[PDB]
Design an enzyme around this catalytic site. Structure first.
Site, PDB file in Angstrom:
ATOM      1  N   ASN A 193      -0.452   3.219   5.242  1.00 39.79           N
ATOM      2  CA  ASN A 193      -0.698   4.184   4.404  1.00 39.79           C
ATOM      3  C   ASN A 193      -2.379   4.802   4.337  1.00 39.79           C
ATOM      4  O   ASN A 193      -3.285   3.994   4.893  1.00 39.79           O
ATOM      5  CB  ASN A 193      -0.829   3.525   2.852  1.00 39.79           C
ATOM      6  CG  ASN A 193      -0.784   4.638   1.677  1.00 39.79           C
ATOM      7  OD1 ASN A 193      -0.361   5.920   1.930  1.00 39.79           O
ATOM      8  ND2 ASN A 193      -1.135   4.250   0.483  1.00 39.79           N
TER       9      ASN A 193
ATOM     10  N   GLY B 163       0.477  -6.671  -1.963  1.00 41.87           N
ATOM     11  CA  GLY B 163       1.680  -7.410  -1.501  1.00 41.87           C
ATOM     12  C   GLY B 163       1.277  -7.969  -0.611  1.00 41.87           C
ATOM     13  O   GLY B 163       0.345  -7.582   0.107  1.00 41.87           O
TER      14      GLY B 163
ATOM     15  N   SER C  43       0.918  -1.130   0.005  1.00 40.20           N
ATOM     16  CA  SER C  43       0.083   0.046   0.033  1.00 40.20           C
ATOM     17  C   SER C  43       1.055   1.290  -0.097  1.00 40.20           C
ATOM     18  O   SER C  43       1.942   1.385   0.936  1.00 40.20           O
ATOM     19  CB  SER C  43      -0.885   0.310   1.258  1.00 40.20           C
ATOM     20  OG  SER C  43      -1.695  -1.306   1.506  1.00 40.20           O
ATOM     21  N   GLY C  44       0.960   2.279  -0.899  1.00 42.53           N
ATOM     22  CA  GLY C  44       1.414   3.321  -1.228  1.00 42.53           C
ATOM     23  C   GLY C  44       2.695   2.980  -2.066  1.00 42.53           C
ATOM     24  O   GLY C  44       3.917   3.875  -1.996  1.00 42.53           O
TER      25      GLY C  44
ATOM     26  N   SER D 164      -4.889   2.576   1.037  1.00 41.67           N
ATOM     27  CA  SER D 164      -4.643   1.104   0.765  1.00 41.67           C
ATOM     28  C   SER D 164      -5.810   0.618  -0.061  1.00 41.67           C
ATOM     29  O   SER D 164      -6.841   0.800   0.247  1.00 41.67           O
ATOM     30  CB  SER D 164      -4.770   0.528   2.060  1.00 41.67           C
ATOM     31  OG  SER D 164      -4.378  -0.857   1.920  1.00 41.67           O
ATOM     32  N   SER D 165      -5.247   0.029  -1.332  1.00 41.71           N
ATOM     33  CA  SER D 165      -6.350  -0.690  -2.287  1.00 41.71           C
ATOM     34  C   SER D 165      -6.923  -2.031  -1.718  1.00 41.71           C
ATOM     35  O   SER D 165      -6.183  -2.949  -1.785  1.00 41.71           O
ATOM     36  CB  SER D 165      -6.048  -0.700  -3.421  1.00 41.71           C
ATOM     37  OG  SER D 165      -5.649   0.652  -4.141  1.00 41.71           O
TER      38      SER D 165
ATOM     39  N   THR E  14      -1.035   1.438  -8.510  1.00 40.62           N
ATOM     40  CA  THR E  14      -2.207   2.174  -9.517  1.00 40.62           C
ATOM     41  C   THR E  14      -1.317   3.529 -10.238  1.00 40.62           C
ATOM     42  O   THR E  14      -1.871   3.612 -11.265  1.00 40.62           O
ATOM     43  CB  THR E  14      -3.170   2.724  -8.373  1.00 40.62           C
ATOM     44  OG1 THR E  14      -3.821   1.755  -7.649  1.00 40.62           O
ATOM     45  CG2 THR E  14      -4.251   3.133  -9.129  1.00 40.62           C
TER      46      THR E  14
ATOM     47  N   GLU F 286       0.817  -8.556   3.115  1.00 39.68           N
ATOM     48  CA  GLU F 286       0.460  -7.331   4.053  1.00 39.68           C
ATOM     49  C   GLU F 286       0.839  -7.897   5.519  1.00 39.68           C
ATOM     50  O   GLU F 286       0.387  -8.932   6.225  1.00 39.68           O
ATOM     51  CB  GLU F 286      -0.935  -7.127   4.272  1.00 39.68           C
ATOM     52  CG  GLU F 286      -1.356  -5.920   5.202  1.00 39.68           C
ATOM     53  CD  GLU F 286      -2.505  -4.894   4.604  1.00 39.68           C
ATOM     54  OE1 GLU F 286      -3.397  -5.406   5.106  1.00 39.68           O
ATOM     55  OE2 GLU F 286      -2.471  -4.126   3.981  1.00 39.68           O
TER      56      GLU F 286
HETATM   57 MG    MG Z   1      -4.088   1.738  -5.674  1.00 36.98          MG
END
Ligand code: MG
Ligand code: ADP
Ligand code: ADP
Ligand code: ADP
Ligand code: MG
Ligand code: MG
Ligand code: MG
Lengths: 148, 370, 711, 360, 371
Positions: free
Chosen positions: C148, C380, C98-99, C151-152, C103, C382
């Site tokens: 982050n 990834g 995340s971060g 986070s997605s 994206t 976590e």
């Molecule tokens: Mg993302």
């Protein structure tokens, strides 16, 4: 060297040399040797011209005579590059292999790589390498034009 | 965290905690329970055995067994389950971090402290351990160097006279009658009114009656005559199924067994004569300071009226010029543990531990030499 | 150049410190991209580097992987030209923390395809729809974490779809692994999906009045559990206006947007419902103020909703039986409806974008061609100090996308050597199948034991589940708990926890909330109540045909397993590529490089193990024609044309280049090169030989230049 | 596809379906009809009955085995549309049944139906799964058996299990007997299936039998009418609660046993003193003979009179009482810890049908 | 005329007679039967209630009630009918003219001894009475002052060690498991072959099966493996309608409930371990003479092979130098009554009766001072 010039070929080469000689001094500038060879349709490199000029520039005067031009013409006639060699030399720069390159991507390789074209020489190339204005050269047809 | 463990393996309750705590962290019944019935429901995590408070919470479907009886460890496999539960579940510590002070009754079998030592050093890998006599510890908790200690637990009653810190080992009296014999006698008694308690799970209900209803008569023949005259002494208790039972002269017949062991068929004299006999085995110069310092400890000394009866009974025995006095602290039930807390916190004691290195030089028999 | 651009080059390759030093060395010189053979490692600079302009997509277009420093454009050309010549589907897999830049990487792949492909108008339309929809999918599918801000919490899968002419026909967009538990229950210091806070802070007062919403997020039971309702780094009052533009640019009508916001508002109201016991301990809804608004906003009748939140329906000999819910089950039924409504609405937004990417062609002859350039943006490994049901599922996803990496890449490379007839010993590897089966196996795995404790009779709890892992997976080499652990290990692992030895190393899981988060008791009474809805979106989310399903409700772990099995299946048919993405700081800033974080990235991405395997195998292959036509200009006997068999022309060329017998292999129809060093040396020789090719063209041009304008 | 089958072979109705469904797919009578095809089964016989209708199960025992093979064949082939060779099968039984009944279920599942693996659960145990509990006393009451199983924290108490060979069929025969006092006659096996529907639609349990008997004697206020398939109208009164009272006063059959409430209390009183509290708060009910209006209210009123005044007495009577044994089997056969409990056909080859007593 | 009466109120049988007799004069079941169905023949002499051998022969139309369960009189009006039937119908005597010896289990409620005395004096008007302990009586019949008595009746099993004529009250064990608990287990266990005995009259048929086909296995696991491997251990019994029923391992599984009380969910030790636990509660000096004098008493001690099993099972527990011996005489079903005859006849017993005069000085609590 590989062949001996016929008196008619010597006379044709002397008549082409007369456009550069003009006033009758019988001698041409060391780089202008390339221009008279190219007027006679040869494809000499600047490094080939320098490697020949290194054997005649030995007493200066910035210039070379008709007999030593005629001798350096007979040097360049040994091992001239083939149409297929120049076609494949463009094909190595084609990114898609389809027979076409863009005027900008040609300007890129022609200004990046040694014995570089000047912007005026690329503009004079792109004037008809792009035949009608779409921004692309068919390099296979352009090599068959350029080798004529 | 190299603080000492103090573990008081009673017959009835484990008390355990760290030296320099005020009171035990773990206090739970010294039981292992095994399911006596068919486990039809496949879903839930049935255990082959339960220990302590989960054994006491599930008790209707278990058979409950105590590994300690009369202060002697009779089942070492159940006792390893109790010590494992003590360290791992109740205290939440590794015994390898902590030197462990254990407790034992006087006049016990020698194998009982050898095998208790072998298990601490070869099963629990303890860094150092010790086995104190329980009634010596009660005297640290009382804040004394001189006194006679009457300790009564769930398995054993014992007397230890101590004068200026010297325990007098020939004058030690032991009596294998305490709280579980009083439960088993209350189970014999309670059938006279019609209440039948017979299972290992019902013994725990008769124990809970004894802990809440019973008291020591200041004069047994007058309380017996009082309960025969009127319902002034009768009290009620409600069972786990909501039945109400009424108890009467049974409230003071059960505790009287300490003063009259012949109620359970024993030849012995009671806790008052055993105390006086122990004092009278001591030197005449010592007796005055023992009479004025009868310390009481362990749960079987918790009855209402027991220190008042003991004072009356020892005054009938002792010379009229003595000041017979009985020390029965409110924390009587934890004094053996509070003593082991003080002892294991003393700087002078830290040379007296048996270390694992001394158990490597000599076998389990090292414990008789420290 | 700075440090070695391909980690297969470094010689101390068994050492973790030499790898992190080459990242540290390259990164601080702005060289943010580095390979592991064909795999890319990408470090997030947290600032604008101008390396993505049109001139860079030109610089990389059709250039070979070894001529240029690493970039996404070098991977993008490689996966595109694989599709454009083998005509078999591909999948670019992006993963990292995340971060970490997944994206932002996905955005630069789409800009690259749009500028490099033959059809710039349809390339522009598929780019723009996949980019302009991004603020919507981020608002509905990302959330704030302990680490982050954005986070997605789902895997986003995206295609650009190509014909045999090599032009983008259309796209696809799909969304596999939405974290349903977060809609209802956040851990301390984590917040719910961004749309709620963007709605409350950013909305017009008339809209929030229409929805029945007050501004303060702590007034909603589903927003408050995170204890971070207000954050300084996030501007909810401004992301909302970009989010609302993005809905408007996907061609949503204002009617669809008010239908959609009514669901976000309804999920807030669904959290505020409080049950209390009747005299039979049955749940009754105590309030009316939530059900007042839910009646309008979900478009379902208020008595019907009050009944469905408090009763479960079974259908037997045609008779329908309402059985009332104990108020623990009514809390699960309320929350299962919130998770269901939100999941199905996110799936509806994704499907609403997907139907606008579809092919405009007739799907009929001469239609006989589909090829897909799929992308996946997936999280990834976590790992936190406190790991829960969310990380257990996420890390089980990365366990399975590794099991697939073995199957599609480390096995197909051995089968490439045996098909091409190279006598070479296989590289030793560790196999995730033992760990996949620890998690997923039908009646043995952790997900099956977790689903049992949600279904089991009696007072089942998170700790009673842990006791059942301990007895069921008792002998296993990759599972451990404080009870099963030795004393050396029991200091590092507590009584509320278990440990899995994942392929990339241990992760330690707190069982607290595993039973509350795995339960998704969406009874059919709540489905058919929603099928009947007058809200157009809920009538498309809940469908009359689903009421034919006779099964008990599936738990969130089974629903994640069944959708992960669909993500694996949708990739298994395609040839993979990989990008691994590295977050250099837990708090942004450019240039700063946290080695305690990056050593954890490099560990759990498995970059050392991929390097050990990739360096032991061969670095490069080509079909002899595709090798020969490139490199023949170095070898006069093959220049300008070779008259013999392609393999024979390569056979003289590798003698001309002077390759030693350990450097190369002549396979059945492919040449192979073992060490990248040999290929770098060859590519550097070609790069000086190009000077001669240009000199010949320039001399030939100068031989034509005069003759067309004189005499 | 290969989930477990769950098949509650009830004495009155077959309930069958798959482990994982929230309700049975097949629910049909344990009836074989023969004309008065060579035979008809289930709903086909129940609609064609102008047939001699026979139940192969009486009081939870399979009395006719060739008709039970026809019901299992109809269950798998016609109703579930399923091949038994592909699916392990969870069967059920009452407690205290003959051992030949399990052994011949076991043999017929393996040697006629070629089932891969099978298990026989006690029906009142499964009813405690569907009610979500591991402590409770279950009163299960079907067509043929009423039985109590007390369970504490997942351990059953076989000495405190009680069984009564009186349930819904004995009540149907008793209603069919009382109705003759009105001048309504029912003596055919088809007419017995009419009177079962009268019982299921008109009857209820009186909170106080003597007050309802006084209510129906003093007024028409309790009477109701039923329309026969023939079109006639039959009016019923004190028969609406006389019929179900036979669970509480079984002496109306001429039985000698204690009532359904006393049998439930006598089970609690055979249990250990400590557990009785959690049994009184968890009297679970299941099976169709627990479905009368007022029965959970009567049963609480009666167990409140027997048990001590301080006990909270609760009766768990779900709206789906009638399918809780099957729902409980659906849960049991889904548990991952259950998949080692099955008898497999390999185990049935190394030891014959008697294996079912070691496994179940 | 006024010779003593002896009445062993069993849980299952009344045994009664005069103290001069060699065996009980009246032996009959301790049941009251009440008619169940409604009588239809007017002028048929059907009674309100039936007792003993009349209730046992009319049991098709009656429910049978036992007023004693586990040695406790649970129903005192039914028990007055049993005592009234005993005196007036069976013995043919007036109880107002005979001093009456009664019997009890050791660890009973005191209300049982009190109300049994209140009824014998205020109802049956007896001149004098006493409440002896059943296992103490069984020793007089056995001809000895020392022994441990194991008595098992229809409702109580109890162990009473006596040495040189002194009981040891702390060593007394009581187990509420005997013949009716073995019948109720056989009623449950016959369901496995598909025989459903359920009514109070069918309990009498399962009682008669237990009394005729059951035996105690010398080694239970070797008999279980034998009955699983052959029909040799199976026996038929013909039910009262003429149905033959066959039973096999149920024959020796039923009495094994004594050696394994866990078969009926009871937590207790078996009768062998309870015998040993009583000897081990006694003084070390008396244990040798208890091991050589195990008296067995009451009808549940009648199974073929129960002396051999009990000798084997205590020989496994005691020190191997002990000469364990078990006194199981042919008459042991009546030794409590035969021992009560000896006691009530002894010249030295005749001051131990509670007299009617002493019951007028002090109420029912007089019993605890005398017994
Ligand atoms: Mg993302
Ligand atoms: N309040 C009380 N009144 C009487 N007896 C008690 C009381 N509290 C505990 N006991 C009894 O004391 C015994 C436990 O005492 P304890 O000192 O813990 O013994 P031990 O050390 O052997 O475990 C049990 O028999 C218990 O029932
Ligand atoms: N609504 C009801 N009211 C009363 N009795 C019912 C009701 N529904 C079913 N029953 C009766 O209960 C029996 C069916 O119950 P069930 O649980 O299916 O029995 P079984 O397990 O033996 O098949 C039949 O006698 C039926 O008439
Ligand atoms: N031969 C026998 N074998 C087994 N049990 C017997 C036998 N004879 C009598 N019984 C049982 O013994 C009990 C009667 O014995 P008894 O000593 O008179 O008991 P109680 O005094 O309690 O009535 C009954 O349970 C009866 O069934
Ligand atoms: Mg103690
Ligand atoms: Mg049923
Ligand atoms: Mg009888």
């Amino acid at each position: 060297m590989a062949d001996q010039l016929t008196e008619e070929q010597i006379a044709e080469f002397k008549e082409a040399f007369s456009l550069f000689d003009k006033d009758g001094d019988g001698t041409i500038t060391t780089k202008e040797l390339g221009t008279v060879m190219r007027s006679l349709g040869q494809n000499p490199t600047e490094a080939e011209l320098q490697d020949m000029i290194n054997e005649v520039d030995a007493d200066g005067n910035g210039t070379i005579d008709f007999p030593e031009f005629l001798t350096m013409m007979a040097r360049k006639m040994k091992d001239t590059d083939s149409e297929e060699e120049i076609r494949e030399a463009f094909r190595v720069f084609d990114k898609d292999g389809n027979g076409y390159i863009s005027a900008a991507e040609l300007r890129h390789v022609m200004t990046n790589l040694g014995e570089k074209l000047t912007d005026e020489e690329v503009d004079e190339m792109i004037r008809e390498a792009d035949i009608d204005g779409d921004g692309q050269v068919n390099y296979e047809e352009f090599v068959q034009m350029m080798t004529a | 965290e190299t603080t000492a463990l103090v573990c008081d393996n009673g017959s009835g309750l484990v008390k355990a905690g760290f030296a320099g705590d005020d009171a035990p962290r773990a206090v739970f019944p010294s039981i292992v329970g095994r399911p006596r019935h068919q486990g039809v429901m496949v879903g839930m995590g049935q255990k082959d055995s339960y220990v302590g408070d989960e054994a006491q919470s599930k008790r209707g479907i278990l058979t409950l067994k105590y590994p300690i009886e009369h202060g002697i460890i009779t089942n070492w496999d159940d006792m390893e389950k109790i010590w494992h539960h003590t360290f791992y579940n109740e205290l939440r510590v590794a015994p390898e971090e902590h030197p462990t002070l254990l407790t034992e009754a006087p006049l016990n079998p020698k194998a009982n402290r050898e095998k208790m030592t072998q298990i601490m050093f070869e099963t629990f890998n303890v860094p150092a351990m010790y086995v104190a006599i329980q009634a010596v510890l009660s005297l640290y908790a009382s804040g004394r160097t001189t006194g006679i200690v009457l300790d009564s637990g769930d398995g054993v009653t014992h007397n230890v006279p101590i004068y200026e810190g010297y325990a007098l080992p020939h004058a030690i009296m032991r009596l294998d009658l305490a709280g579980r014999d009083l439960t088993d006698y209350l189970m014999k008694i309670l059938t006279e009114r019609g209440y039948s308690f017979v299972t290992t799970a019902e013994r725990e209900i008769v124990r809970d009656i004894k802990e809440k209803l019973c008291y020591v008569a200041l004069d047994f023949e007058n309380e017996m005559a009082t309960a025969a005259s009127s319902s002034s002494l009768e009290k009620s208790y409600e069972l786990p199924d909501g039945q109400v039972i009424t108890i009467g002269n049974e409230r003071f017949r059960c505790p009287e067994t300490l003063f009259q062991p012949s109620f359970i068929g024993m030849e012995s004299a009671g806790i008052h004569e055993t105390t006086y006999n122990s004092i009278m085995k001591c030197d005449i110069d010592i007796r005055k300071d023992l009479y004025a310092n009868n310390v009481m400890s362990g749960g079987t000394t918790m009855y209402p009226g027991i220190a008042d009866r003991m004072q009356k009974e020892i005054t009938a025995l002792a010379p009229s010029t003595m000041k017979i006095k009985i020390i029965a602290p409110p924390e009587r039930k934890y004094s053996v543990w509070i003593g082991g807390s003080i002892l294991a916190s003393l700087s002078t004691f830290q040379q007296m531990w048996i270390t694992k290195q001394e158990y490597d030089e000599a076998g389990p028999s090292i414990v008789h030499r420290k | 150049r700075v440090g070695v651009q391909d980690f297969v080059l470094l010689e101390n390759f068994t050492s973790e410190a030499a790898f992190i030093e080459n990242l540290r060395r390259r990164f601080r010189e702005n060289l943010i991209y580095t390979y592991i053979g064909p795999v890319l490692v990408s470090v997030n600079p947290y600032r604008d580097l101008q390396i993505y302009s049109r001139q860079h997509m030109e610089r990389y277009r059709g250039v070979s992987f070894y001529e240029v420093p690493p970039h996404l454009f070098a991977v993008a050309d490689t996966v595109y030209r694989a599709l454009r010549t083998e005509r078999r589907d591909q999948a670019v897999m992006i993963s990292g923390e995340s971060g970490a830049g997944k994206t932002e990487a996905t955005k630069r792949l789409l800009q690259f395809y749009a500028e490099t492909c033959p059809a710039p108008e349809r390339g522009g339309a598929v780019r723009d729809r996949l980019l302009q929809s991004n603020p919507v999918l981020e608002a509905f599918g990302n959330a704030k974490t302990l680490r982050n801000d954005n986070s997605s919490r789902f895997g986003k899968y995206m295609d650009v779809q190509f014909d045999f002419k090599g032009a983008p026909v259309g796209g696809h967009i799909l969304s596999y692994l939405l974290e349903k538990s977060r809609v209802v229950h956040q851990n301390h210091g984590e917040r719910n999906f961004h749309v709620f806070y963007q709605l409350l802070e950013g909305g017009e007062e008339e809209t929030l009045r229409r929805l029945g919403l007050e501004r303060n997020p702590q007034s909603y039971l589903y927003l408050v559990k995170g204890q971070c309702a207000k954050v300084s780094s996030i501007n909810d009052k401004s992301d909302w206006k970009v989010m609302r533009k993005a809905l408007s640019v996907i061609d949503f009508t204002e009617d669809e947007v008010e239908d959609l916001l009514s669901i976000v508002a309804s999920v807030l109201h669904l959290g505020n419902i409080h049950f209390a016991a009747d005299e039979d301990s049955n749940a009754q809804v105590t309030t009316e103020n939530q059900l007042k608004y839910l009646t309008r906003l979900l478009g379902v009748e208020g008595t019907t909703l009050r009944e469905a939140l408090t009763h479960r329906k079974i259908i037997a000999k045609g008779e329908e039986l309402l059985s009332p819910l104990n108020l623990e089950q009514a809390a699960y039924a309320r929350d299962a409806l919130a998770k269901a409504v939100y999941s199905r609405t996110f799936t509806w937004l994704v499907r609403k974008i997907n139907r606008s990417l579809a092919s405009k062609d007739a799907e009929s002859p001469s239609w006989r061609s589909t090829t897909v350039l799929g992308l996946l943006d997936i999280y990834g490994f976590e790992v936190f100090q406190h790991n829960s049901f969310e990380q257990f599922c996420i890390n089980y996803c990365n366990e399975k996308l590794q099991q697939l990496f073995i199957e599609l890449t480390l096995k197909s490379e051995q089968e490439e050597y045996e098909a091409e007839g190279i006598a070479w010993e296989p590289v030793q590897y560790f196999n995730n199948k033992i760990i996949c089966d620890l998690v997923e196996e039908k009646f043995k795995g952790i997900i099956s034991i977790l689903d049992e404790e949600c279904l089991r009779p009696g007072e089942a709890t998170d700790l009673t589940f842990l006791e059942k892992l301990e007895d069921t997976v008792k002998p296993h080499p990759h599972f451990l708990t404080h009870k099963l652990a030795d004393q050396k290990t029991r200091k590092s692992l507590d009584r509320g926890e278990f440990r899995l030895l994942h392929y990339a190393g241990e992760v330690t899981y707190s069982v607290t909330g595993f039973l509350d988060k795995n339960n998704d008791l969406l009874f059919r009474n709540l489905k058919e109540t929603m099928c009947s809805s007058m809200n157009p979106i809920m009538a498309q989310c809940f469908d009359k045909s689903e009421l034919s399903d006779k099964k008990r409700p599936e738990t969130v772990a089974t629903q994640f397993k069944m959708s992960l099995l669909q993500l694996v299946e949708i990739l298994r048919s395609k040839e993979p590529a990989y990008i691994r993405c590295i977050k250099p700081n837990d708090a942004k800033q450019p240039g700063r490089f946290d080695e305690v974080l990056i050593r954890h990235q490099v560990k759990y991405l498995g970059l050392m193990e991929n390097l050990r395997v990739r360096r032991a195998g061969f670095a490069y292959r080509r079909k002899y024609e595709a090798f020969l036509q490139r490199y023949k200009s170095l070898c006069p006997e093959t220049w300008p044309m070779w008259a013999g068999r392609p393999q024979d022309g390569v056979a003289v060329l590798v003698r001309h280049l002077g390759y030693k017998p350990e450097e190369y292999k002549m396979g059945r129809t492919k040449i192979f090169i073992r060490f990248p060093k040999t290929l770098f040396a060859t590519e550097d020789s070609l790069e000086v030989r190009r000077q001669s090719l240009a000199t010949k063209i320039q001399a030939a041009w100068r031989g034509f230049h005069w003759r067309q304008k004189f005499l």
